[PDB]
Amino acid sequence: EMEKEFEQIDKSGSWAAIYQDIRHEASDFPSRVAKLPKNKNRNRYRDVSPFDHSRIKLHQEDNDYINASLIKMEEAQRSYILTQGPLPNTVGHFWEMVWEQKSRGVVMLNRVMEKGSLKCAQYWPQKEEKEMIFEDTNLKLTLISEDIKSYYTVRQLELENLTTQETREILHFHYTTWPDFGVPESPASFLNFLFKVRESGSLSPEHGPVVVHCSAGIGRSGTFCLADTCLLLMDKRKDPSSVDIKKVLLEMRKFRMGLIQTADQLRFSYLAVIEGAKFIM
């Protein structure tokens, strides 16, 4: 059981060691499309690339590339799209992907500015009366409502395909309190946030996969998917303690490199799953 494994690693201070074993066992697949010269300005970080096999393709004949990966967890019946925070030049691609994949929710785990630098373009409207038009992808985006809470903000957005005049409601879940350095001290507000996304229906199989991002789409974004999938598997299985976090992480790393960036994020993921299991048992 992971609670006992937690105390062991913690008491022995072995987190950096566990973390390095995961690094060494992780899959390595080609990412040829990401490294094409015509795609250099579509990537926020030169060392964070989607694998070719799991990359999301845009349905535009010109250049189909976005820094985004489909993570398919077969046993849990959960999919996720993990992507980077959009760049000024990819905001239109981001919303085209949301449209084409029939996503119902966007989960944002970063602030637009952290450590005095921009981690993400402002890709949604700040006021009802000031909608955004993406000329490159023929989409209009309107803020419908915004509910600001202590630890997160939920926004209802309307996305309109200007080509067909179809409209969809998108939910934007913005976790606003992840600290600039390290991880939250307690997983309570992160779990509350994760249950709010679940309650919305955004993670349900009647919709396209949820879009999850931070700045690179690997660290905080990884912690989100890892916790959700692990808690779902504990509901589904005859023996809940058959769930090995490390194995689940390695299965997710077949789909996108580098998920969980630090030994601290790994420790936090254990704590979130352990604490979340109490609200699920």
XYZ file of N, CA, C and O in Angstrom, residues 148-259:
448
model
N -15.203 33.730 -9.506
C -13.869 33.830 -8.861
C -13.979 33.328 -7.438
O -14.690 33.908 -6.718
N -13.229 32.300 -7.070
C -13.132 31.774 -5.697
C -11.707 31.946 -5.218
O -10.857 32.459 -5.957
N -11.467 31.563 -3.988
C -10.187 31.800 -3.273
C -9.038 31.148 -4.043
O -8.013 31.779 -4.178
N -9.207 29.896 -4.478
C -8.107 29.026 -4.969
C -8.223 28.837 -6.490
O -7.256 28.388 -7.103
N -9.376 29.120 -7.089
C -9.590 28.895 -8.539
C -10.727 29.774 -9.026
O -11.533 30.238 -8.227
N -10.793 29.914 -10.334
C -11.815 30.644 -11.090
C -12.397 29.681 -12.116
O -11.641 28.896 -12.729
N -13.707 29.708 -12.288
C -14.386 28.950 -13.360
C -14.975 29.986 -14.267
O -15.645 30.883 -13.762
N -14.780 29.835 -15.551
C -15.367 30.733 -16.545
C -16.198 29.893 -17.512
O -15.788 28.795 -17.890
N -17.405 30.347 -17.832
C -18.189 29.836 -18.981
C -17.826 30.680 -20.194
O -17.812 31.925 -20.057
N -17.505 30.023 -21.312
C -17.083 30.669 -22.553
C -17.992 30.136 -23.636
O -18.438 28.982 -23.514
N -18.254 30.956 -24.636
C -18.919 30.500 -25.853
C -17.894 30.568 -26.966
O -17.346 31.627 -27.219
N -17.735 29.447 -27.648
C -16.846 29.299 -28.813
C -17.763 29.149 -30.010
O -18.619 28.247 -29.989
N -17.595 30.008 -30.994
C -18.420 30.003 -32.212
C -17.516 29.776 -33.414
O -16.501 30.513 -33.600
N -17.912 28.805 -34.222
C -17.262 28.525 -35.518
C -17.852 29.503 -36.527
O -19.006 29.324 -36.877
N -17.097 30.513 -36.932
C -17.625 31.601 -37.786
C -17.969 31.029 -39.168
O -18.768 31.638 -39.876
N -17.364 29.900 -39.533
C -17.537 29.232 -40.849
C -18.927 28.590 -40.915
O -19.479 28.590 -41.981
N -19.453 28.061 -39.817
C -20.700 27.254 -39.782
C -21.726 27.863 -38.824
O -22.843 27.332 -38.724
N -21.351 28.915 -38.104
C -22.187 29.531 -37.045
C -22.638 28.501 -36.000
O -23.519 28.846 -35.213
N -22.000 27.335 -35.870
C -22.231 26.506 -34.654
C -21.554 27.172 -33.443
O -20.512 27.813 -33.593
N -22.092 26.936 -32.262
C -21.567 27.469 -30.997
C -21.525 26.324 -29.992
O -22.379 25.442 -30.038
N -20.541 26.364 -29.107
C -20.425 25.424 -27.989
C -20.068 26.221 -26.751
O -19.317 27.206 -26.842
N -20.498 25.701 -25.638
C -20.111 26.214 -24.339
C -18.843 25.456 -23.918
O -18.876 24.251 -23.837
N -17.791 26.173 -23.561
C -16.548 25.610 -22.988
C -16.444 26.080 -21.536
O -16.658 27.260 -21.269
N -16.063 25.202 -20.628
C -15.761 25.576 -19.240
C -14.244 25.733 -19.081
O -13.511 24.876 -19.491
N -13.812 26.855 -18.536
C -12.404 27.160 -18.223
C -12.211 27.055 -16.725
O -12.809 27.815 -15.977
N -11.416 26.090 -16.295
C -11.094 25.852 -14.888
C -9.680 26.330 -14.670
O -8.780 25.713 -15.174
N -9.515 27.378 -13.889
C -8.222 28.070 -13.738
C -7.818 27.951 -12.291
O -8.445 28.619 -11.450
N -6.863 27.081 -11.992
C -6.282 26.964 -10.645
C -5.265 28.086 -10.505
O -4.311 28.122 -11.279
N -5.507 29.014 -9.586
C -4.812 30.339 -9.563
C -3.773 30.389 -8.441
O -3.045 31.326 -8.438
N -3.656 29.388 -7.587
C -2.881 29.492 -6.323
C -1.741 28.491 -6.263
O -1.195 28.273 -5.171
N -1.343 27.897 -7.377
C -0.137 27.046 -7.314
C 1.034 27.998 -7.067
O 1.184 28.991 -7.750
N 1.895 27.771 -6.064
C 2.945 28.748 -5.770
C 4.031 28.794 -6.863
O 4.240 27.811 -7.578
N 4.693 29.953 -6.992
C 5.756 30.223 -8.004
C 6.865 29.178 -7.857
O 7.405 28.765 -8.883
N 7.156 28.750 -6.628
C 8.213 27.745 -6.327
C 7.588 26.575 -5.563
O 6.709 26.785 -4.698
N 8.044 25.368 -5.861
C 7.628 24.184 -5.096
C 6.186 23.807 -5.389
O 5.708 24.044 -6.516
N 5.513 23.227 -4.411
C 4.161 22.635 -4.623
C 3.335 23.146 -3.472
O 3.927 23.603 -2.509
N 1.992 23.103 -3.526
C 1.180 23.458 -2.360
C 1.539 22.587 -1.146
O 1.995 21.425 -1.321
N 1.413 23.164 0.053
C 1.776 22.508 1.338
C 0.789 21.368 1.578
O 1.242 20.259 1.914
N -0.497 21.643 1.358
C -1.625 20.681 1.482
C -2.240 20.425 0.103
O -2.416 21.350 -0.678
N -2.635 19.174 -0.222
C -3.393 18.899 -1.437
C -4.890 19.184 -1.368
O -5.574 18.927 -2.334
N -5.384 19.752 -0.274
C -6.837 19.918 -0.097
C -7.402 20.764 -1.236
O -8.415 20.378 -1.816
N -6.847 21.934 -1.534
C -7.517 22.828 -2.520
C -7.351 22.256 -3.946
O -8.211 22.410 -4.787
N -6.267 21.558 -4.204
C -6.061 20.878 -5.505
C -7.114 19.770 -5.712
O -7.687 19.683 -6.816
N -7.392 18.973 -4.672
C -8.446 17.906 -4.719
C -9.804 18.528 -4.908
O -10.568 18.041 -5.758
N -10.094 19.603 -4.176
C -11.397 20.308 -4.329
C -11.555 20.741 -5.788
O -12.637 20.591 -6.359
N -10.487 21.292 -6.364
C -10.456 21.742 -7.771
C -10.700 20.548 -8.693
O -11.537 20.626 -9.622
N -9.954 19.476 -8.479
C -10.130 18.237 -9.311
C -11.572 17.710 -9.226
O -12.146 17.431 -10.269
N -12.211 17.715 -8.054
C -13.626 17.249 -7.921
C -14.542 18.219 -8.623
O -15.489 17.766 -9.309
N -14.207 19.506 -8.632
C -15.057 20.467 -9.379
C -14.982 20.172 -10.858
O -16.006 20.301 -11.559
N -13.785 19.872 -11.373
C -13.717 19.579 -12.828
C -14.558 18.316 -13.097
O -15.235 18.235 -14.134
N -14.412 17.314 -12.263
C -15.169 16.045 -12.457
C -16.672 16.335 -12.455
O -17.398 15.831 -13.340
N -17.122 17.113 -11.477
C -18.570 17.401 -11.310
C -19.137 18.080 -12.531
O -20.325 17.955 -12.740
N -18.326 18.791 -13.293
C -18.795 19.592 -14.441
C -19.202 18.680 -15.588
O -19.727 19.202 -16.575
N -18.703 17.442 -15.608
C -18.886 16.561 -16.779
C -17.781 16.655 -17.818
O -17.871 15.972 -18.827
N -16.766 17.490 -17.595
C -15.698 17.794 -18.570
C -14.805 16.568 -18.842
O -14.132 16.555 -19.908
N -14.757 15.631 -17.888
C -13.872 14.440 -17.921
C -14.675 13.216 -18.352
O -14.106 12.129 -18.377
N -15.896 13.421 -18.794
C -16.827 12.316 -19.088
C -16.726 11.878 -20.540
O -16.424 12.651 -21.440
N -16.984 10.574 -20.805
C -16.795 10.014 -22.140
C -17.765 10.519 -23.207
O -17.495 10.362 -24.319
N -18.841 11.186 -22.814
C -19.795 11.840 -23.748
C -19.197 13.128 -24.335
O -19.899 13.791 -25.123
N -17.987 13.523 -23.926
C -17.286 14.673 -24.551
C -15.927 14.233 -25.063
O -15.441 13.260 -24.565
N -15.327 15.050 -25.910
C -13.918 14.955 -26.272
C -13.064 15.104 -25.025
O -13.540 15.459 -23.936
N -11.770 14.766 -25.148
C -10.873 14.838 -24.003
C -10.731 16.289 -23.512
O -10.689 17.241 -24.297
N -10.654 16.402 -22.216
C -10.291 17.651 -21.523
C -8.909 18.101 -22.017
O -8.026 17.241 -22.282
N -8.742 19.411 -22.180
C -7.437 20.031 -22.469
C -6.839 20.520 -21.174
O -7.505 21.280 -20.457
N -5.639 20.053 -20.844
C -4.958 20.422 -19.578
C -3.659 21.121 -19.965
O -2.959 20.619 -20.865
N -3.352 22.250 -19.341
C -2.049 22.896 -19.592
C -1.536 23.613 -18.358
O -2.316 24.043 -17.497
N -0.229 23.770 -18.346
C 0.498 24.713 -17.455
C 1.380 25.527 -18.410
O 0.905 25.902 -19.482
N 2.661 25.732 -18.128
C 3.502 26.423 -19.133
C 4.001 25.416 -20.171
O 3.831 25.669 -21.391
N 4.649 24.343 -19.740
C 5.202 23.341 -20.678
C 4.177 22.228 -20.955
O 4.345 21.504 -21.935
N 3.174 22.050 -20.102
C 2.236 20.920 -20.248
C 2.788 19.584 -19.779
O 2.340 18.563 -20.325
N 3.675 19.558 -18.778
C 4.296 18.280 -18.339
C 4.326 18.177 -16.825
O 4.227 17.053 -16.353
N 4.478 19.282 -16.091
C 4.724 19.244 -14.642
C 3.437 19.247 -13.846
O 2.937 18.159 -13.460
N 2.881 20.415 -13.617
C 1.575 20.531 -12.916
C 0.493 19.748 -13.680
O -0.368 19.138 -13.033
N 0.501 19.827 -15.000
C -0.465 19.142 -15.900
C -0.387 17.638 -15.649
O -1.412 16.989 -15.580
N 0.829 17.117 -15.524
C 1.101 15.719 -15.147
C 0.492 15.324 -13.821
O -0.150 14.268 -13.753
N 0.646 16.163 -12.804
C 0.122 15.928 -11.440
C -1.405 15.808 -11.498
O -1.982 14.916 -10.830
N -2.051 16.649 -12.298
C -3.516 16.658 -12.445
C -3.996 15.302 -12.984
O -4.888 14.643 -12.313
N -3.487 14.899 -14.150
C -3.884 13.626 -14.820
C -3.531 12.422 -13.932
O -4.391 11.549 -13.719
N -2.343 12.415 -13.358
C -1.878 11.281 -12.541
C -2.837 11.065 -11.353
O -3.238 9.896 -11.093
N -3.217 12.127 -10.654
C -4.124 12.031 -9.497
C -5.497 11.557 -9.961
O -6.065 10.650 -9.362
N -6.047 12.154 -11.004
C -7.391 11.774 -11.481
C -7.412 10.257 -11.833
O -8.352 9.556 -11.414
N -6.472 9.798 -12.663
C -6.406 8.420 -13.171
C -6.238 7.467 -11.982
O -7.018 6.527 -11.883
N -5.301 7.708 -11.093
C -5.069 6.844 -9.908
C -6.339 6.711 -9.047
O -6.673 5.583 -8.658
N -7.035 7.803 -8.760
C -8.273 7.756 -7.941
C -9.383 6.989 -8.662
O -10.092 6.223 -8.009
N -9.511 7.170 -9.972
C -10.495 6.427 -10.790
C -10.195 4.915 -10.748
O -11.176 4.120 -10.627
N -8.919 4.523 -10.863
C -8.531 3.091 -10.851
C -8.839 2.487 -9.472
O -9.190 1.312 -9.434
N -8.674 3.245 -8.391
C -9.002 2.769 -7.027
C -10.507 2.538 -6.896
O -10.887 1.617 -6.201
N -11.345 3.279 -7.599
C -12.802 3.018 -7.608
C -13.121 1.738 -8.382
O -14.160 1.148 -8.162
N -12.368 1.447 -9.418
C -12.799 0.472 -10.436
C -12.335 -0.907 -9.973
O -12.946 -1.872 -10.347
N -11.234 -1.003 -9.244
C -10.544 -2.300 -9.021
C -11.091 -3.022 -7.789
O -11.401 -2.318 -6.738
N -11.082 -4.370 -7.861
C -11.492 -5.238 -6.722
C -10.607 -4.911 -5.520
O -11.169 -4.724 -4.427
N -9.295 -4.785 -5.739
C -8.304 -4.400 -4.702
C -7.753 -3.008 -5.005
O -6.852 -2.873 -5.836
N -8.298 -1.939 -4.375
C -7.744 -0.579 -4.490
C -6.237 -0.369 -4.314
O -5.728 0.500 -4.958
N -5.570 -1.151 -3.467
C -4.122 -1.012 -3.152
C -3.286 -1.743 -4.208
O -2.070 -1.794 -4.062
N -3.895 -2.345 -5.220
C -3.157 -2.832 -6.413
C -2.697 -1.642 -7.278
O -2.031 -1.880 -8.282
N -3.067 -0.405 -6.942
C -2.750 0.768 -7.802
C -1.340 1.244 -7.470
O -1.125 1.695 -6.378
N -0.417 1.114 -8.417
C 0.981 1.560 -8.258
C 1.134 2.885 -9.037
O 1.148 2.875 -10.293
N 1.260 3.990 -8.307
C 1.436 5.354 -8.878
C 2.563 5.338 -9.917
O 2.371 5.901 -11.015
N 3.694 4.726 -9.566
C 4.925 4.737 -10.399
C 4.616 4.058 -11.722
O 5.078 4.563 -12.758
N 3.849 2.963 -11.706
C 3.488 2.259 -12.959
C 2.542 3.138 -13.772
O 2.624 3.109 -14.987
N 1.569 3.761 -13.119
C 0.613 4.641 -13.834
C 1.378 5.796 -14.497
O 1.130 6.082 -15.676
N 2.294 6.414 -13.777
C 3.125 7.503 -14.335
C 3.893 7.005 -15.554
O 3.913 7.718 -16.585
N 4.502 5.827 -15.469
C 5.290 5.311 -16.615
C 4.382 5.033 -17.799
O 4.820 5.299 -18.931
N 3.161 4.531 -17.570
C 2.192 4.321 -18.678
C 1.829 5.672 -19.318
O 1.580 5.732 -20.550
N 1.728 6.730 -18.519
C 1.324 8.059 -19.053
C 2.495 8.641 -19.848
O 2.251 9.291 -20.871
N 3.720 8.395 -19.390
C 4.958 8.861 -20.087
C 5.162 8.171 -21.433
O 6.001 8.636 -22.202
N 4.412 7.129 -21.765
C 4.481 6.592 -23.144
C 3.868 7.604 -24.111
O 4.102 7.467 -25.358
N 3.019 8.511 -23.595
C 2.205 9.406 -24.447
C 2.749 10.835 -24.515
O 2.550 11.508 -25.533
N 3.414 11.276 -23.470
C 4.087 12.588 -23.463
C 5.264 12.531 -22.510
O 5.137 12.018 -21.407
N 6.395 13.067 -22.958
C 7.652 13.014 -22.197
C 7.541 13.906 -20.968
O 6.825 14.924 -20.999
N 8.241 13.524 -19.918
C 8.620 14.413 -18.823
C 7.510 14.684 -17.848
O 7.716 15.518 -16.952
N 6.398 13.963 -17.920
C 5.282 14.228 -16.991
C 5.790 14.078 -15.562
O 6.352 12.977 -15.255
